[PDB]
With several copies, the nearest count.
Chain A
Amino acid sequence: MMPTPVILLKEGTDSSQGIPQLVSNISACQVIAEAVRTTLGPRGMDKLIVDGRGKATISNDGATILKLLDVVHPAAKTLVDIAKSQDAEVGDGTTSVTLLAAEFLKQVKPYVEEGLHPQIIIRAFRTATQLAVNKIKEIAVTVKKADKVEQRKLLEKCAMTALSSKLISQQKAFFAKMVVDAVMMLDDLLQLKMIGIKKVQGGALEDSQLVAGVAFKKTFSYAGFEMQPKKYHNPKIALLNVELELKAEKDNAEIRVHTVEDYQAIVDAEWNILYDKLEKIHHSGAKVVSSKLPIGDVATQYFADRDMFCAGRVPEEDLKRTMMACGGSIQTSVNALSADVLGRCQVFEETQIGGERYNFFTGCPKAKTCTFILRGGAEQFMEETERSLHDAIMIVRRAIKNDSVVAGGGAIEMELSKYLRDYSRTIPGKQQLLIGAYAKALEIIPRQLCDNAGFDATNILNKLRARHAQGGTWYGVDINNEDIADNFEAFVWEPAMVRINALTAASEAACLIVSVDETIKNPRST
């Protein structure tokens, strides 16, 4: 009843200010965190979310959950945007980052209600963040056994760990070995665009295969492609961007004829031009001819009578991979074809995996790409499998170039809280209530790694506190025995960068929330 001037300042704008607005902003962050609280750890559960199309997605990755929640609260969006970054920078840093960032605010929530201006909180968050990050660098371990079985084992252990919290139980040795070896097929850019994953329905997880070469799905064909046998033991591959239709035109020409002699000559010329191109393709050995452009009926029969195979309408993404897989080049014009532009492989066959036809290439020793073929009993089943392969490849790619790893589980988070407590007990004044709050939030990881599957959370956390304060700092939470286990000796390792970036992103998220005092929402929304 108060803002009732004779002339309004703006229009109809909502505005909140002060302590209830900060509490509301923190509360929104606590609620959105609920979407991932049960997804952490090897015994996390999956979520089923239905979109407006009626299609469900089943997943447990934070980078897929938070994007489907239809968040509108200005503050809750903060914990989503930081997931967008961690998806690129880290990969594993999804559920753990969201939960820690939310806890950073919960620990100070009971204090921000009664004074304690955010200006002092933000400075303490920055101090504690720098302390925690430096501590990781001082404890991470490396190896000196590069280009030996010791590095292969490191990468395999990184892959088997990366495959945790997926729809994977006994297939870790099956997928992990192929992920490590698939990446070693790449050049020294390790560009992920060189690894394809394709889903073929039918069969179990263990029936998947890693193909050194490429394959295409045999798209729209014409009458005559039931012919051309699919048995080749040493084919050459021509990748062309040439039109092989009779109706190919320049779209701007008109052929004006004044006599019958030229009438027939044009009719014959149109057929002769097509045959000229086909004869130039021949005499090359390119028994396999592929193009992104149509290949018409006349060419299909020409190739059949010449004992050649062709297939058109191949997407550019597969032609580029085919070029890199077969070791050749892609030529647009046929007027300059030679043996020096063709690809080569040993086996080219059309198989029937899952009932659908697939044309596989293999046998090229200079294959810079590969394709992993997934088999499964459902669309969603394979879709979740594909996601598990993308993360495992990402962790292995990074582990090859950065061998600095830390203990998994909550082992590092307990040591970080130990270091911060040792710091805080040497600092006088208000900082004791702020550095400690940062440290206390760090236990959300070993807590949730127990709450989602029992393990007597109260006492097993007390054990971690007793052990880390007296002995080693690599102790975490086992899954098989409901007690403490040494993650270092068990080789439960994660790249050091996962936690370093998690601390940075979680700290910045907190500073974005506590630094806001006012929210202004324009009324114009149509």
Chain B
Amino acid sequence: GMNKMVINHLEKLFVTNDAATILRELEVQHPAAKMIVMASHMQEQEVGDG
């Protein structure tokens, strides 16, 4: 895969391909899309990968 260069709401630049940290910087407001993003937190907490 390819890297993203993401600048968050604090004007900080994060360059990575790890979705666990990309999704934390994307300011998703859609009331339903949030739920599929939040699910990824339980995956990271339980095993830390995937």
A contacts B directly (C-beta below 8 A): yes
Chain A contact residues, CB within 8 Å of chain B: 7-11, 13, 74-75, 77, 118, 512, 515-522, 524-525
Partner of A516 from B5, B7, B26, B29 at Cβ < 8 Å: B5
Partner of B27 from A11, A74, A525 at Cβ < 8 Å: A11
Q: Do the beta carbons of B15 and A512 come within 8 Å of each other? A: yes
- For B4, give the chain A residue with the smallest CB separation: A518
> B8 contacts the other chain (Cβ, under 8 Å)?
yes
In B1-45, which residues have CB < 8 Å from any A CB? 2-9, 11, 13, 15, 25-31, 33
Q: Do the beta carbons of B28 and A520 come within 8 Å of each other? A: no
Q: Do the beta carbons of A8 and B2 come within 8 Å of each other? A: no
Given contact pairs A118-B2, A516-B2, A517-B2, A522 touches B29 in the complex (Cβ within 8 A)? no
Given contact pairs A8-B29, A9-B29, A521 touches B3 in the complex (Cβ within 8 A)? no
Q: How many A-B residue pairs have CB under 8 A?
A: 55
Contacts of B13 in A (CB 8 A): 74, 77
Q: Do the beta carbons of B5 and A519 come within 8 Å of each other? A: yes
Q: Do the beta carbons of B7 and A522 come within 8 Å of each other? A: yes
Given contact pairs A7-B30, A9-B33, A10-B29, A520 touches B15 in the complex (Cβ within 8 A)? no
Contacts of B31 in A (CB 8 A): 7
Given contact pairs A74-B13, A512-B15, A525-B11, A519 touches B4 in the complex (Cβ within 8 A)? yes
Other A-B pairs beyond A13-B27, A522-B25, 6, CB < 8 Å = A9-B33, A11-B27, A517-B2, A518-B2, A522-B9, A525-B11
Chain A's nearest CB lies how many Å from the CB of B10?
Answer: 8
Chain A's nearest CB lies how many Å from the CB of B8?
Answer: 5
- For A14, give the chain B residue with the smallest CB separation: B7
Chain A's nearest CB lies how many Å from the CB of B7?
Answer: 5
- For B11, give the chain A residue with the smallest CB separation: A525
Count chain B residues whose beta carbon lies closer than 8 angstroms to a beta carbon of A.
19
Contacts of A75 in B (CB 8 A): 5
Q: Which of A7, A74, A520 has the most CB of B within 10 A?
A: A520
Contacts of A515 in B (CB 8 A): 2-3
Which 4 interchain pairs have the tightest Cβ spacing? A517-B2, A524-B9, A520-B6, A519-B5
Contacts of B25 in A (CB 8 A): 522
Contacts of A525 in B (CB 8 A): 11
Q: Do the beta carbons of A520 and B29 come within 8 Å of each other? A: no
Q: Do the beta carbons of A8 and B5 come within 8 Å of each other? A: no
Given contact pairs A74-B13, A512-B15, A525-B11, A520 touches B30 in the complex (Cβ within 8 A)? no
Ordered by A's residue number, 5 sampled pairs between the chains whose C-beta atoms are within 8 Å are: A8-B29, A9-B29, A9-B30, A74-B7, A520-B5
Contacts of A9 in B (CB 8 A): 28-30, 33
Contacts of B30 in A (CB 8 A): 7-10
Given contact pairs A522-B8, A522-B9, A525-B11, A516 touches B3 in the complex (Cβ within 8 A)? yes
Chain A's nearest CB lies how many Å from the CB of B21?
Answer: 13
Q: Do the beta carbons of B4 and A520 come within 8 Å of each other? A: yes
Q: Do the beta carbons of B7 and A11 come within 8 Å of each other? A: no
Q: Do the beta carbons of B27 and A517 come within 8 Å of each other? A: no
Contacts of B15 in A (CB 8 A): 512, 516
Chain A's nearest CB lies how many Å from the CB of B3?
Answer: 5
Given contact pairs A9-B30, A9-B33, A74 touches B2 in the complex (Cβ within 8 A)? no
- For A18, give the chain B residue with the smallest CB separation: B2
Q: Do the beta carbons of A524 and B27 come within 8 Å of each other? A: yes
Contacts of A118 in B (CB 8 A): 2
Contacts of A10 in B (CB 8 A): 26-30
Q: Do the beta carbons of B2 and A520 come within 8 Å of each other? A: no
Partner of B7 from A517, A518, A521 at Cβ < 8 Å: A521
Contacts of A7 in B (CB 8 A): 30-31
Q: Do the beta carbons of B4 and A522 come within 8 Å of each other? A: no
- For A9, give the chain B residue with the smallest CB separation: B30
Contacts of B29 in A (CB 8 A): 8-11
Chain B's nearest CB lies how many Å from the CB of A9?
Answer: 5
Contacts of A522 in B (CB 8 A): 6-9, 25, 27
- For B17, give the chain A residue with the smallest CB separation: A515
Chain B's nearest CB lies how many Å from the CB of A317?
Answer: 34
Contacts of A8 in B (CB 8 A): 29-30
